[PDB]
Design a protein around this ligand. Structure first.
Ligand SMILES: [Cl-]
Ligand code: NA
Ligand code: NA
Ligand code: NA
Lengths: 146, 4, 94
């Protein structure tokens, strides 16, 4: 055939891939974390948006830190061979490097490690997108007039 | 407006 | 013959390192609102980094907090694209 380039990921596998949306709105009273009003608007917008991109969307609501880790582990052990990519959306409280389950925190590194090229071989070489709506600390940006 |  | 085990990840953060992220209780979060809008408008047109750059500009320019508390009033947000991708990403093909 003619000359070829490979500057772009192959996105014409039979499936675009999974879109896991973790929507944490209500937190265990003992954590002292407030409810995240408006997050259901986010979860619904994401579901529709990624549905139109032909992702297999799975919405999950109010997961404990244990459920988050087990979900990510189980998803990483699926056969992604026929899928172009992987998307995970996290909607929760957070701080730098951390996302909160309903009962306590989860290291972002623990979540993403399941999808390392050596630990999820059927996603190796494929784009793994983590979209994170969560605080990364407590600084506020005062902005500057244009 | 609220923070996360 | 090998690729890095950390290759081919992209982290689309809502906010800069160390900062709060803003969520509106009626409209949803600034970042997710803007992300869905730009995916809706540009997923059949633009490479994903260029989509996320439009998201950055939308959040940075169109949003500013309103609070009865002076500490939290009139604040801004810039999202933070962290790419360890090795190729361009288009959601369309052919
Ligand atoms: Cl809500
Ligand atoms: Na949210
Ligand atoms: Na990879
Ligand atoms: Na936001």
């Amino acid at each position: 055939s003619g000359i070829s380039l490979d500057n772009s990921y192959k996105m014409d596998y039979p499936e675009m891939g999974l879109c896991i949306i973790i929507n944490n709105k209500n937190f265990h009273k003992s954590t002292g974390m407030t409810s995240r009003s408006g997050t259901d608007v986010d979860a619904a917008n994401l579901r529709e948006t990624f549905r139109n991109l032909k992702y297999e969307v799975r919405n999950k609501n109010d997961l404990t830190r244990e459920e988050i880790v087990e979900l990510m582990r189980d998803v990483s052990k699926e056969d992604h061979s026929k899928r172009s990519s992987f998307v995970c959306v996290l909607l929760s409280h957070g701080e730098e490097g951390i996302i909160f389950g309903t009962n306590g925190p989860v290291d972002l590194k623990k979540i993403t490690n399941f999808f390392r090229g050596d630990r999820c071989r059927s996603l190796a070489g494929k784009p793994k997108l983590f979209i994170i709506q969560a605080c990364r600390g407590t600084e506020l940006d005062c902005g500057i007039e244009t | 407006d609220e923070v996360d | 013959h090998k690729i890095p085990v950390e290759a081919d990840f992209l982290y689309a953060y809502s906010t800069a390192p160390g900062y709060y992220s803003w969520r509106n209780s009626k409209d949803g979060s600034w970042f997710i609102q803007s992300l869905c809008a730009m995916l809706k408008q540009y997923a059949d047109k633009l490479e994903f980094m260029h989509i996320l750059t439009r998201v950055n500009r939308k959040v940075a320019t169109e949003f500013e907090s309103f609070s009865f508390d002076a500490t939290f009033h009139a604040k801004k947000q810039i999202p933070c694209i962290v790419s360890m991708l090795t190729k361009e990403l288009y959601f369309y093909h052919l």
